[PDB]
Nucleic acid binder design. Structure first.
Ligand SMILES: [Mg+2]
Lengths: 678, 105
DNA sequence: TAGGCACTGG
DNA sequence: CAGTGCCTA
């Protein structure tokens, strides 16, 4: 087993030069540095570990080091280099599994300061290295009277860089051994720093293998990217901006500008007593100025001020439809009586309240809808074009958006998305959603050989969360709930229980039940907010004893205040639980997350087994995985049909693999883009 | 006997009135404005026949002040034949104002 | 819409 | 950094 790390001249996307690398070999207990002219030897060493059926450990190697080495070997040495997935270990991936209850800077992309809770020490250091190196470079130059350029520290190899490289491997080795010291995931009787790859995966907790496979596949998904219709979004941008201006023109006419205090630097005090008046806006008292400037009658002073005469400095302000403060100011002045305020003390003005607001003036009453529309349009513009993370700012040269994915960003095993967040694109049911979704599609990628548009296969797991509930209930109801889902009407069944009016309300109720929603959210489904919210849940459980039995066995496992602060996930991993009340929900959500994770992994492995190649230079390409659905780009319709049926096969395999008490299914849809494939 | 203007009446009451007119741009929430207010009441009485004192609350009539800039309040503008002849900003004393007026009148 | 990401205002 | 919206049931 070897631990390694490399330093190169840029992020994966534009890297062109290997600066150096370091290898620590457990078999020799020695660190070896490789400088620029040793690139070839570095590669030879990695492949030799592979020849021995060994393991290579990197920190974030799955997303950077491994693919960057393949890219660099080809560019600099005209060599084909492809480390197999089976021989690689990623301490970042392992940390996210073992310390899933903690957040991380995602390798320095996020400001540690904004993250909640504590951060794992070794991991924190690794993620801050680049910024740290940049600060040492910046200094050495600033000390030699030499100018600094934004990112020149990464242009050429140097000994300071080499030192950081070596430090990286020492810290990664420390992290690794710390992770491996966790007996829950690695049996104590085995020295995992002294075994072959097959033994490492087979003898460690199943979750270890699943997380590495998920990370490898998702790294490939990121590199694939999601084909994006830049031109269409630009046209959408023009349309949105025009409607924004017009809405602004109207609203600014309806609500005119006004003045507000600004720049005051002196407390206003009652001239009579001298009593400070902190409530009154700040004033300014001119030190110079007079009626007739300093000297037969003198000359009049053309200045606007007069020494000692105070005034309140003010600035002109124009109505801003995006300012909740301005909206609140203008509406109360119309006869609106704020019913709900915030904790920081302030009128609550979300879209909900704006809908209930009523004012006498008919024009101001109608303007509220214009304000609502302005806020929504502002939302669409920020997301697609003007925000810092706008889609138009992320489209790469290959005409695709390569959004990032943290495979295990949630403690339940659920993944998170960012840069940009491709799991928050407006749905087809939302205003402008159809245009937004149609812009992300396999059709926007023209085959490298034939120029023909690719086709899209959208696959979703069917009612996964409910089926997971059925599965866990089987120990108590012997599969009754699961049978009703597959061959009956679970919703009307849930309606009769908890006694509800519409069967659609049953659905609303259950889907909210699975995602531990407060009693309040339950009430709003009937129209008794937070009131019947306690009654409903209770009546449901009463008529569905298997669920109450489950909740009870779940809490007995945790509460003795705690005998254990986690539940065992489907692959054996610990899943932190915040409160006993959340136990069940955590259980269900984790089951769904892990089933979908293993599912997408098996789906891709089966496709490859069938002879299909993963990549734009191949037959299919994973473009997006959003909770329970995956969107896959396919070179031909025939392939898309194969992907759809293969995904169903993979899901059944997963249900059988984990002895699931409820049958699992998927539903697939073929089409040119995400608007049609959802 | 002070003239309480509105945006709609400003043009006629000020820019077309005969003689000098002292306009006071103020706000209810301004300490300095509340200070000079009673002073304005007195000047209006003592200069009756020689000067016309007018007031414009900028919150009730937001369309006029912008036309003259106004960076602070109270802003006292002396008009003559529909044009600004003199301007002072701040809560002047009855004396400084009396001096400002006599000097400009 | 519970959890995350991200935006605009001040 | 506060107040919100957008996704996912
Ligand atoms: Mg590195």
């Amino acid at each position: 087993m070897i631990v390694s790390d490399i330093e190169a001249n840029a992020l994966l996307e534009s890297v062109t030069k290997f600066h150096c690398g370091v290898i620590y070999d457990y078999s020799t207990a020695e660190y070896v540095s490789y400088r620029p002219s040793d690139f070839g030897a570095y590669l030879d060493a990695l492949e030799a570990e592979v020849a021995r059926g060994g393991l290579i450990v990197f920190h974030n190697g799955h997303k950077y080091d491994v693919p960057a080495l393949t890219k660099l070997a080809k560019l600099q040495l005209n060599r084909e280099f492809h480390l197999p997935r089976e021989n690689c270990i990623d301490t970042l991936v392992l940390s996210r599994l073992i310390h899933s209850n903690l957040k991380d800077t995602d390798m320095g992309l996020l400001r540690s300061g904004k993250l909640p809770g504590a951060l794992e020490a070794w991991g924190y250091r690794l993620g801050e290295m680049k910024g740290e190196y940049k600060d040492d470079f910046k200094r050495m130059l600033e000390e030699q009277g030499e100018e600094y350029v934004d990112g020149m520290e990464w242009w050429n190899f140097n000994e300071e860089m080499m030192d950081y490289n070596v430090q990286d491997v020492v810290v990664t080795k420390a992290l690794l051994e710390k992770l491996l010291s966790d007996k829950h995931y690695f049996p104590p009787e085995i020295d995992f720093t002294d075994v072959g790859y097959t033994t490492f995966w087979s003898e460690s907790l199943e979750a270890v293998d699943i997380e590495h496979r998920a990370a490898w596949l998702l790294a490939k998904q990121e590199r694939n990217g999601f084909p994006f219709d830049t031109k269409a979004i630009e046209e959408l941008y023009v349309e949105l901006a025009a409607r924004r201006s017009e809405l602004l023109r109207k609203l600014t006419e309806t609500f005119g500008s006004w003045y507000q205090p600004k720049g005051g630097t002196e407390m206003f005090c009652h001239p009579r007593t001298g009593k400070p008046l902190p409530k009154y806006p700040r004033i300014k008292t001119p030190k110079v100025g007079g009626i007739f400037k300093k000297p037969e009658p003198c000359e009049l002073d053309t200045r606007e001020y007069v020494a000692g005469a105070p005034y309140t400095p003010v600035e002109h302000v124009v109505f801003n439809p995006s300012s909740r403060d301005h909206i609140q100011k203008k509406l109360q002045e119309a006869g609106w009586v704020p019913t709900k305020y915030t904790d920081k003390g302030a009128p609550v003005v979300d879209d909900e309240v704006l809908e209930g607001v009523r004012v006498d003036d008919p024009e101001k009453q109608a303007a509220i809808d214009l304000i609502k529309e302005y806020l929504m349009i502002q939302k669409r513009i920020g997301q697609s074009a003007e925000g810092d993370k706008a889609w138009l700012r992320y489209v790469a040269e290959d005409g695709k958006i390569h959004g990032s994915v943290n495979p295990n960003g949630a403690v339940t095993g659920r993944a998170t998305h960012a840069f940009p967040n491709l799991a928050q694109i407006p749905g087809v049911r939302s205003p402008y959603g159809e245009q937004c979704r149609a812009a992300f599609g396999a059709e926007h990628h023209l085959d490298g050989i034939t120029g023909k548009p690719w086709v899209q296969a959208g696959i979703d797991a069917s009612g996964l969360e409910l089926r997971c509930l059925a599965h866990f209930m089987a120990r108590f109801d012997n599969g009754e709930y699961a049978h009703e889902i597959l061959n009956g009407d679970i919703h009307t069944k849930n309606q009769i229980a908890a006694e509800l009016p519409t069967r659609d309300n049953a659905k609303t109720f259950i889907y909210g039940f699975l995602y531990g929603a407060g009693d309040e959210k339950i009430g709003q489904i009937v129209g008794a907010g937070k009131e019947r919210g306690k009654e409903l849940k209770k009546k449901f459980l009463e008529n569905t004893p298997a669920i109450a039995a489950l909740r009870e066995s779940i809490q007995q496992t945790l509460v003795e205040k705690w005998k254990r602060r986690w539940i065992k996930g489907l692959d054996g991993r610990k899943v932190h639980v915040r409160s006993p009340h959340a136990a069940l929900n955590t259980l269900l959500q984790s089951a769904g997350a892990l089933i979908c994770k293993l599912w997408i992994i098996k789906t891709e492995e089966m496709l490859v087994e069938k002879g299909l190649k993963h990549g734009w230079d191949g037959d299919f390409a994973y473009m997006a995985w959003v909770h329970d659905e995956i969107q896959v780009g396919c070179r031909t319709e025939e392939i898309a049909q194969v992907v759809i049926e293969t995904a169903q096969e993979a899901m059944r395999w997963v249900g059988d693999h984990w002895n699931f008490r409820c049958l699992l299914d998927t539903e697939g849809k073929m089409g040119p883009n995400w608007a049609i494939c959802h | 006997k002070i003239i309480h203007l509105t945006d709609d009446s400003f043009d006629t009451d000020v820019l077309k009135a005969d003689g000098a007119i002292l306009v006071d741009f103020w706000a209810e929430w301004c300490g300095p404005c509340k200070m000079i207010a009673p002073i304005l009441d007195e000047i209006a009485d003592e200069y009756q026949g020689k000067l016309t004192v007018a007031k414009l609350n900028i919150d009730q009539n937001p369309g006029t002040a912008p036309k003259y800039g106004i960076r602070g309040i109270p802003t006292l503008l002396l008009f003559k034949n529909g044009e600004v002849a003199a301007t002072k900003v701040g809560a002047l004393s009855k004396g400084q104002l009396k001096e400002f007026l006599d000097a400009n009148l």
